[PDB]
Amino acid sequence: QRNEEKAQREANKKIEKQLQKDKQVYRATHRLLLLGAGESGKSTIVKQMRILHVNGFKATKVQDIKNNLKEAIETIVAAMSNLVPPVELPENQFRVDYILSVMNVPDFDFPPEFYEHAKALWEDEGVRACYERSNEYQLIDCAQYFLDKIDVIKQADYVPSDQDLLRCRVLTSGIFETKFQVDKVNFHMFDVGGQRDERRKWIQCFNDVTAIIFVVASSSYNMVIREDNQTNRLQEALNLFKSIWNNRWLRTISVILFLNKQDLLAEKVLAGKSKIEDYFPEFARYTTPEDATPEPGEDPRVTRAKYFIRDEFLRISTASRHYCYPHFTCAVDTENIRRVFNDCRDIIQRMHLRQYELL
């Protein structure tokens, strides 16, 4: 009958009205895609945005700190003997095998008997001697900030602060999105993924994002990638950056560059030990460019090192529509992301290429 036709037309009208209402909100959002290498700081920024531009943001989050504490102290003791030169310290000898005994078990030593004597190893000179040289083995980058603050949170949950929550490292299960609220149209920032893949077939989907944010570490110029003895952790980022730029799918997409771990880089150069020239041979002849604006908080020696790293990345971009932007960031300091954030916004696609009318 015609009643069925009338009902279908009414349903089509309702669906069309819903589609028309929903179309407007999609045409205004700006989407940003994070990128980088393994253990670089991508997920830290996403958590940082929530704690800054969103009022919102517990017991489960407390448990992973204890899990992190069990791993950080295990690696240092395990590599004491496995290190090629002997670096062994007789204190806590009866605990050394205890660490090896509990080094592999699904259930951690929840009893406080573990915490009382593991603190002695931290105070022991033998463990501190191994911690001085950490280039040979692989160690979590947040080990020191957690070992010192031991038993402050072991007594009870004690609602650990955000500063002690951001530094916690948790593997990415899948995609990790966030839609914060801003006076302009709300943005859609999403993490790249969980596991590193060389082929990267899914990148063909991302062909409409306004900007691509690239995050690279700077305090790792003398450590190998997770797969041992592969290459310098900085060189593995250089090869990835070159591949991203020379990609068929990404032909008209801008790139924003972040150089995190500035504080870690500052402490490494100051306290001698390994030098840039030993690992990078072309650093000796470098001269600091005149067009430099160092911030008034660094001695002239370290400032010579920051611009060499930037020069290596930027040389790749200028060889080959596409533009690149350099920046210096330290993700943990809450204020620093905002200072770039309230700045990043102003020029990109903002009076820059904004003027798409033929000039």
Binding site: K184, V185, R350, M351, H352, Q355, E357, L358, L359
Partner: protein
């Protein structure tokens, strides 16, 4: 036979606009480009009331084009200036075509010209409003845009075609209109004759 060559020349103008005949900014330009046969007149006016309609249509088209270009320039400049953005056609013609057919006009010999069945005599205020008001906004909006490029060659090269073409095509006509003597009656037609070439530019 010179006019016949021009008759085919102005005939070729329609093809360019017809060939063009999509976004938010492109919607405005559709009417601007879309918006003369009686030029020869054997050196016409079959109907006495028919002559007034041609002049009214010409004036309305001119003011509509000026208003449309003003609107598009202002919109583009405002869009460029402010990141993250969030009825003239009827109005201009309403106040322009009405006096033409409303017996709103202006010598003893002049009345004789109306008595004999294509004299043009008069509406400068429609003029100053039609051209001077639009140009003043048009220079200002463009002036901000050039500085934005300077903050961050080709810009001046395109801006020349954007502005100077219309300026040279129209401002001398405005100067001729304000002259109304020392201007030949036949000479004035030539200045307005080149006005239709602007429609061929777009």
């Amino acid at each position: 036979g010179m006019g016949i060559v021009m008759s085919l020349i102005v005939l070729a103008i329609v093809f360019g606009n017809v060939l063009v005949i999509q976004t938010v900014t492109n919607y405005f330009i559709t009417s601007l480009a879309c918006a003369v046969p009686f030029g020869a007149a054997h050196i016409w006016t079959f109907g006495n009331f028919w002559c007034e309609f041609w002049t009214s249509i010409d004036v309305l088209c001119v003011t509509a084009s000026i208003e449309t270009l003003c609107v598009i320039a202002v919109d583009r400049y405002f869009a460029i200036t402010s990141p993250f953005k969030y009825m003239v056609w009827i109005v201009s013609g309403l106040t322009s075509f009405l006096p033409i057919q409303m017996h709103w006009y202006r010598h003893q010999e002049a009345i004789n010209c109306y008595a004999e069945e294509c004299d043009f005599f008069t509406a400068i205020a429609s003029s100053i409003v039609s051209f001077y008001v639009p140009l003043v906004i048009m220079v200002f909006v463009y002036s901000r845009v050039f500085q934005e490029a300077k903050r961050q060659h080709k810009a001046l090269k395109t801006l020349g075609i954007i502005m100077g073409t219309f300026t040279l095509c129209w401002l001398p006509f405005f100067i001729v209109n304000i002259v109304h003597n020392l201007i030949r009656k036949e000479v004035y037609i030539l200045l307005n004759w080149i006005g239709y070439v602007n429609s061929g530019f777009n």
